[PDB]
Design an enzyme around this catalytic site. Sequence first.
Site, PDB file in Angstrom:
ATOM      1  N   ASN A 176       0.689  -1.275  -0.191  1.00 63.91           N
ATOM      2  CA  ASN A 176       0.029   0.091   0.176  1.00 63.91           C
ATOM      3  C   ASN A 176       0.918   1.380   0.047  1.00 63.91           C
ATOM      4  OD1 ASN A 176      -2.174  -1.702   0.001  1.00 63.91           O
ATOM      5  ND2 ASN A 176      -2.569  -1.266   2.385  1.00 63.91           N
ATOM      6  N   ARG A 221     -10.849  -4.881 -16.634  1.00 62.24           N
ATOM      7  CA  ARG A 221     -10.136  -5.200 -17.752  1.00 62.24           C
ATOM      8  C   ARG A 221     -10.362  -6.402 -18.424  1.00 62.24           C
ATOM      9  NH1 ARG A 221      -4.810  -3.686 -14.836  1.00 62.24           N
ATOM     10  NH2 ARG A 221      -5.042  -6.131 -13.962  1.00 62.24           N
ATOM     11  N   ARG A 237      -3.297   3.626 -23.293  1.00 60.83           N
ATOM     12  CA  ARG A 237      -2.232   2.840 -23.220  1.00 60.83           C
ATOM     13  C   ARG A 237      -2.057   2.179 -21.972  1.00 60.83           C
ATOM     14  NH1 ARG A 237       0.853   7.305 -23.891  1.00 60.83           N
ATOM     15  NH2 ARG A 237       2.643   6.184 -23.090  1.00 60.83           N
ATOM     16  N   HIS A 280     -17.019   2.442 -14.412  1.00 60.30           N
ATOM     17  CA  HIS A 280     -16.683   1.992 -13.024  1.00 60.30           C
ATOM     18  C   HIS A 280     -17.976   0.997 -12.624  1.00 60.30           C
ATOM     19  CE1 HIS A 280     -15.765   1.601  -8.714  1.00 60.30           C
ATOM     20  NE2 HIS A 280     -14.521   1.468  -9.183  1.00 60.30           N
ATOM     21  N   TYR A 309     -12.059 -10.516  -0.987  1.00 61.56           N
ATOM     22  CA  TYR A 309     -13.072  -9.081  -0.971  1.00 61.56           C
ATOM     23  C   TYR A 309     -14.313  -9.465  -0.666  1.00 61.56           C
ATOM     24  CZ  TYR A 309      -9.845  -5.746  -3.461  1.00 61.56           C
ATOM     25  OH  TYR A 309      -8.762  -5.009  -3.759  1.00 61.56           O
ATOM     26  N   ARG A 344     -13.690   2.352   5.418  1.00 63.32           N
ATOM     27  CA  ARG A 344     -12.454   1.834   5.986  1.00 63.32           C
ATOM     28  C   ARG A 344     -11.492   2.512   5.128  1.00 63.32           C
ATOM     29  NH1 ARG A 344      -9.244  -1.446   2.236  1.00 63.32           N
ATOM     30  NH2 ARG A 344      -9.846  -0.730   0.252  1.00 63.32           N
ATOM     31  N   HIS A 371     -15.403  -4.224   0.986  1.00 61.41           N
ATOM     32  CA  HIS A 371     -15.306  -3.529  -0.132  1.00 61.41           C
ATOM     33  C   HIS A 371     -16.920  -2.937  -0.615  1.00 61.41           C
ATOM     34  CE1 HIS A 371     -14.661  -2.923  -4.553  1.00 61.41           C
ATOM     35  NE2 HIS A 371     -13.728  -2.451  -3.984  1.00 61.41           N
TER      36      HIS A 371
END
Lengths: 648, 605
Positions: A43, A338, A368, A394, A429, A525, A552
């Site tokens: 992180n 992706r 790119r 998103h 997650y 969080r 999450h």
Amino acid sequence: SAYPFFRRDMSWLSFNERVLMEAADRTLPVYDRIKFLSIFSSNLEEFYTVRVAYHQAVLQKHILQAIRETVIRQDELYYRIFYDQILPTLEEHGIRLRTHAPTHPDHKAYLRRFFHEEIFPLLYPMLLLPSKVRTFIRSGRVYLAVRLKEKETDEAYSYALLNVPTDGLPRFVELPRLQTDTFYYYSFLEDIIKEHLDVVFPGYEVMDSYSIKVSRDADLLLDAPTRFMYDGRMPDEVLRYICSSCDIDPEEAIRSGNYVNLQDLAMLPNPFAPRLETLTPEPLLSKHLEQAPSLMEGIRRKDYLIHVPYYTYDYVVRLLMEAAISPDVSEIRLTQYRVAENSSIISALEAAAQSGKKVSVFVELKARFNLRLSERMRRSGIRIVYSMPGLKVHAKTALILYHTPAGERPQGIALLSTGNFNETTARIYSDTTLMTANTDIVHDVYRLFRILDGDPEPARFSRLLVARYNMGEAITNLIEREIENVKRGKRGYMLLKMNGLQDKNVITQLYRASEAGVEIDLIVRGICCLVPDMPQSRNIRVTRLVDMYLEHSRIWCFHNGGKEEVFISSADWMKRNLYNRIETACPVLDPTLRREIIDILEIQLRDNIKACRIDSSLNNIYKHNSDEKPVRAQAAIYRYLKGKEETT
Amino acid sequence: RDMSWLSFNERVLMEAADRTLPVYDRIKFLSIFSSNLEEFYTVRVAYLQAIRETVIRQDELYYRIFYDQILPTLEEHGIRLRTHAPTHPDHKAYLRRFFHEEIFPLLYPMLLLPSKVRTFIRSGRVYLAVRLKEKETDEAYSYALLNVPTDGLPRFVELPRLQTDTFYYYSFLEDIIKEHLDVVFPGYEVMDSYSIKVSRPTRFMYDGRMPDEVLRYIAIRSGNYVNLQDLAMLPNPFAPRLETLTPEPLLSKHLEQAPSLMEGIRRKDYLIHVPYYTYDYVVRLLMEAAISPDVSEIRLTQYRVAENSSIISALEAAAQSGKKVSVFVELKARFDEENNLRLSERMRRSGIRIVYSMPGLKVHAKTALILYHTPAGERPQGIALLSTGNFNETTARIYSDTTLMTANTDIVHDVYRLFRILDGDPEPARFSRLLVARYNMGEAITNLIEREIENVKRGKRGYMLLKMNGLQDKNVITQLYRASEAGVEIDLIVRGICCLVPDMPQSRNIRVTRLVDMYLEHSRIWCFHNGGKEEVFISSADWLYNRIETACPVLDPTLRREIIDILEIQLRDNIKACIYKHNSDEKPVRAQAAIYRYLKGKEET
């Protein structure tokens, strides 16, 4: 107005402090803690390469000094945990991670062989003659800077750079063992190298070596470094000797402990298989879903909520596979972060496209950023459309459409989620997925994808909330409604869970809601810029929950007198989230489903083992309380959900 | 022997010289020559004077083909592989940026100080020995060594192109370093640099322009480019227009027009020959199995678990559909990377059971099994896939392999049993048709040989046709000698390392063909003549006691005809390899092109 706000990076550093704390939690199985040490390191690597870099690019055209001060402090804590607790605890359980060179003959014999046959061939001994020969030091790697004195008793020191070939060897090297032995043995690769430097430099007296590490914005040379971290025993002469080629001021140079790049701790083997680490339970199924004639039939009849790690991930792909070979399905449409790796989902989708069905994948990635995989998919008949600059999608939705008449309502299944469907991370997650056949939602999702696919459609949704469309208003209206209700003398309550809260506007509304007598529970969080325990936040409680699963989910509950409304979202409330991206939020219409989410969130707010409350000084304060019975939300939620499934 | 196979490598270089062949075909043969002369020098020279004289003139033949014929021919077809830095500004800019951003960070410039600091030279890697003066005044020389980082970058760099441009442009990776030496050594006048390459320290191919004193600062002197086997890696801009190594992949049109693949197999056996056919059938069949309600389980052998492939995604999908999915991987890497761990963890999470080869019995048999649901103590009924090659095609050099797809109740039960043996389950170890290494295989082969010998003693012809990668084992070389003297005719089709000498008293009956072609002939086939009722075997290895191997009979007559047809094409006279009468008026062809013409013909029947 006159409202207080934490700086986001300070708030971020607070989050990584809480990650460091998991490592300090002596009630946890060692490998759990070791994992969190590694996480903390990774992180802070990410923070440095995007966030510290940003602030460095600005100061060319205090924040930076504050970061550095904080990091230096956290670093000291890290090594205390590592040397005073972790290494000692490993030994209590038969693991010896050696921090010095072995005295034991057999281990010595082994490593000398190992160095000769396995390490040495992967070395590149580089004498550093600064002005004469240029050298690069890659980021994310560990290098050894060696000081050398030659034949002549002259004080003039030579300097050399060598590689620790972790691109070809493990960071941790196991030493051979007998069942009669007290420990399993491990060594850092760089330690072994240190112990054999004399063979690498035969014509020198090897004076010292020091581990170094550089983080940079990207690995490139300029045509005519956010961090440079090194073992603190290093004299500055040798620093300015690698600075002799790098032009690096003592600002980016941070002296630290004796081992660097410790995110590699994630690679430390646990030779006691499933012991020394919390066993994650077997993922639940929905009995109800399982006992329907087919999965699509199940969702047609009822809405489902899937809470993952607790439930399987399997329902998304299973459903996709049903849809693949079903005559009734005209098209499948989904979002994906992706397209780079192969997956079950891709496979199910390929099958469907080969079965003639219209298959679209909307991918939020960039200019790119694979090539073979996309062509294979297109060949299979799948269509892949990218977000060309401005709005990156998103949103986390899938859509299965049935064949229907002509001007008829689209019929089918919408899948909406707080995270990605594809599980592709080592960290587990926690996320929430709604599966609905609801004709208003299914139509809204239908309409959303047409809009993303550039087709004409009215910018209007029945129940769905889309960013840059109806979402801003909706969030404002919902909060406002609670304010009003308090003025009518009704209860005003909000339960809000997300990864991040940073948007000045929404935060200001929250402050005004607090001021107005509206009570607020925030479960955040990561970054939180709302400052608690203040007059303007007098009615707000801020809970950060960090545990083994990454919390999450993004979920919103508005009390509305008692006609409660619950939303599941793809967005946190950042600046970039509510304005730059296309996001989704969805109402949970089914009452029993809405009830479950609240039950779960209540379990989270009841947590007295992992949960921490935040104060106005950004401190992580454990909500421990011996008087009440112990409850840790990630254990309890699993029991709750398993409970209800035995009630079929 | 060695003089004959150095004259085998003559015949490859001969093809490269052949000016009626398409450029990239010639380029692949040059590439084959370079890899073959290499192998020689690890297994033969390391194991001397008689070698040097004939090799060094081949080296002169090679470089003559390359420079005088290969290079301009490419240019003539609009391919410019430069041997010098570009003057074109756009290109000049590009390579300079490319050097700084991509090459430089992968470099480890080490000054050579021979006795002060010790250093290793990795084999197979290209390096640059660099000669420096710190000033033209000095007369003396510093030296340095530089990596050519082909482990992170391709050997041939393409330069950016406009459709209007005449050419496609390529440069050698090391040449870009050569042109930018002064960024690496700012403190020197960079006097020179030379390509070097070592083998093991047994050999030392290097740039012939290199002085010996710098050679002494660290040996077969050659041209200006080493490791020219890399020329294979050099891309062909024009789809398949200037080569023959990639014709249209063939489909099995019968299987394609069955209602499903699983239906097809259920009704007939099929053979799939790769490069020739699509690689897709295995994956597509696996997916059909993943969605099918009938499929109970899926088993599969793997070498390593390393690549996240279409096949992995399929088995995951199967396991997530609730099916038993076990995977048998024979090697676990020792210095484990996290990407292995991650992939395996994801598969584990998906339901897939990773089972590692329990000691001794490494499975080398590359097989799969799709099982249906069946009543009580019923016979396991499904599909079995047995292959000569690895199921996960992640190759650079192109292998040709053969795959049987069968639902034959005997084989399916046999493969079923085999997986249970690999799954450590105590089992009545008796196979009907399949031959398994430390089980029935050694006895069965022995009989098969002894039935031809028997047949000779009975006045009838004795004949064996064996296609092999090579045959080292003494016991079987002598077993073939035993059959040879007992009047059994023997054909050996082999490619690589083999020590069985022909032309002797014990080998009048053993003919040994060695094909000269582009794809790597990986099929391992056994053909026993059996007095005209022919028996054919697909095999996972060649001659039996170490790992577990499989040999599978080809039961289906038409498929047996097929393989025999293929093998015989590889044995005919107008094909390039090495009393009767005929003339010198037929154009020799390559086995693989003939084979392709054959399989294409068969499909459109």
